[PDB]
Nucleic acid binder design. Structure first.
Lengths: 74, 76, 74, 75
DNA sequence: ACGTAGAAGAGTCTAGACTG
DNA sequence: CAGTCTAGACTCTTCTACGTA
């Protein structure tokens, strides 16, 4: 927990980071925009939404995960 | 048309399964650490909450009308 | 002929049907539609256009490949 | 703008790599049969020819303006 | 500096076998 | 059965190796 969290999450980064949400209101928001604004990418803006909220519910964990993900560029 | 265009559009969706697919390394790692360190964690539940929170913040009017039509259309 | 070509094409059906086209006019039309009509799927209409084009250059060949692709679902 | 709107929208794209990735069993099988049973078969030339043809038949106005700006680009 | 052919791959968006 | 969570066809764009009369 004293920066050990890092290596706990390293076990997970070698697999596809797919998250499957089930919600009527967010699906309706995203789908409505998909059908009214051209070029709308639903799953990228869902990524934006989900990261923004989750970075607010678990700030420390999200910071550590973001660090590991950014330093992952190769 | 009073901007109840939004409700009439969104009603063309209710019959369909509301699955959203997200590809995010940071969010996935946060949810996976939570799932493997707290007992009885529900990953998709927490994902749903984070997504709805952010989506409300980025689209307040859209999400409010969507939440209305979700609670109203699914009460029975 | 004589459905020899049938088994010459069954060799290839185990791989991804990716076809990589580079075409300024086609790309421009597909992108313009992607930015002006909401919900425009660029590559499936590209698929429809390429299948329309072949079905007029190699109608026999396309017919036989189409029978094979349809019956592949089983 | 007087339906020269389309050209203004298109000229915002011209700098890009004009790539198109198609996924279809029938057309893939046909182009592959031709590739293996034709000496020096172009195949991507041919895919481009068929695609441009089909787009012309489907979006003739769009395709004319796009082909106009395409010829215009260099010459 | 390079137009373009193939090849490769991060992502998409729905599907589906599976729990609760 | 409503949601899970991962799997897969398929989307689009980048990448690589390569002759550009």
């Amino acid at each position: 927990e004293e920066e050990k969290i890092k290596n706990d999450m390293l076990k997970y980064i070698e697999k596809d980071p797919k998250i499957g949400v089930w919600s009527y209101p967010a699906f309706l928001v995203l789908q409505y925009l998909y059908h009214t604004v051209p070029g709308f990418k639903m799953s990228r803006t869902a990524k934006e939404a989900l990261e923004k909220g989750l970075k607010e519910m678990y700030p420390t964990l999200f910071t550590i995960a973001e660090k590991i993900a950014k330093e992952r560029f190769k």
